[PDB]
From a paper:
We solved the crystal structure of apo PrgE to 2.7 Å, using the AlphaFold2 model of PrgE as a template for molecular replacement. The asymmetric unit contained two copies of the protein in the space group P212121. Both copies were modeled from residues 1–130, with residues 34 and 35 missing in loop 1 of chain A. For both chains, the remaining C-terminal part (residues 131–144) is missing in the density. Two PrgE molecules are found in the asymmetric unit of the crystal, potentially showing a dimeric form of PrgE when it is not bound to any nucleic acid. PISA analysis shows that this dimer has an interface area of 680 Å2, with 9 H-bonds and three salt bridges. The overarching fold of the protein corresponds to an oligosaccharide/oligonucleotide-binding (OB) fold, characterized by five beta-strands that form a beta-barrel with a 1-2-3-5-4-1 topology, which is only partially closed between strands 3 and 5. PrgE also has a 42-residue-long region between strands 3 and 4 that forms two alpha-helices of which the first seemingly contributes to the opening in the barrel between strands 3 and 5. The apo structure overall aligns very well with the predicted AlphaFold2 model of PrgE, having an RMSD of 0.48 Å over 113 residues.
Numbering used by the authors:
A (entry chain A): 1 to 33, 36 to 130
B (entry chain B): 1 to 130
The structure:
Amino acid sequence: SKYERPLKRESQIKEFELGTHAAVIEKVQKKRSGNDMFLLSLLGKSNEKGVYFLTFGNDYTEDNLRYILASIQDNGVEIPDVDFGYNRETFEFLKGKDVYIQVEEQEYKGKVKHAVTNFLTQDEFEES
Amino acid sequence: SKYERPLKRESQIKEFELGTHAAVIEKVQKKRSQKGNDMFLLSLLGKSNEKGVYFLTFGNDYTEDNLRYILASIQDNGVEIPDVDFGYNRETFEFLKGKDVYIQVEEQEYKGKVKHAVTNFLTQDEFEES
Ligand SMILES: [K+]
């Protein structure tokens, strides 16, 4: 057969549209950049797919996890008295928790994506 | 203008087809039956945006086993089951939310008319068999 540039595969994977969304942290995976990381897979109400990298070791680590925990808290889950950080308690705790999320567009290397940027509180979600 | 019947629209409420599906427990709602049994109503969202429901009834002989089946399915989708007494309580209500499961849809009869209904929660093995 004469070669013919094939059509792009998985063009119709559901991604989040711009704005705020009620989502679930469907999955959590361990990763490494040097930096220790949790990869958070996010699932939308219409099976939209997004990801968020929680990076440990830096200055924003504590705050970034707090917002996640507050968003979980505001989706009707009690935050226990655990030492939250790069540990197994946290890894397990984040799996299958409802959240509010913010989705903005993000340029990288020419093309544009829809990136999950922040985890929102009840108040910040209701604003939008 | 003279009347012409508009074509049937699409159900934005797309129901589950028959057979087996992977889904997530999207929502849990506190209810009470007509008899007076406490109930959890589980909204299930399939991978193709299908939407079904399930009534977990407490205070009968089928309650304890029904939870095992749900909690086993949650366990096999990679979530550790905590050390709590499961029942009509905050800890159960909160835990079930947001969890991936395997379900089995079948034909049932509501007031005589047939409908697609979520019947069982499958372990990993059972899912693959289908
Ligand atoms: K029409």
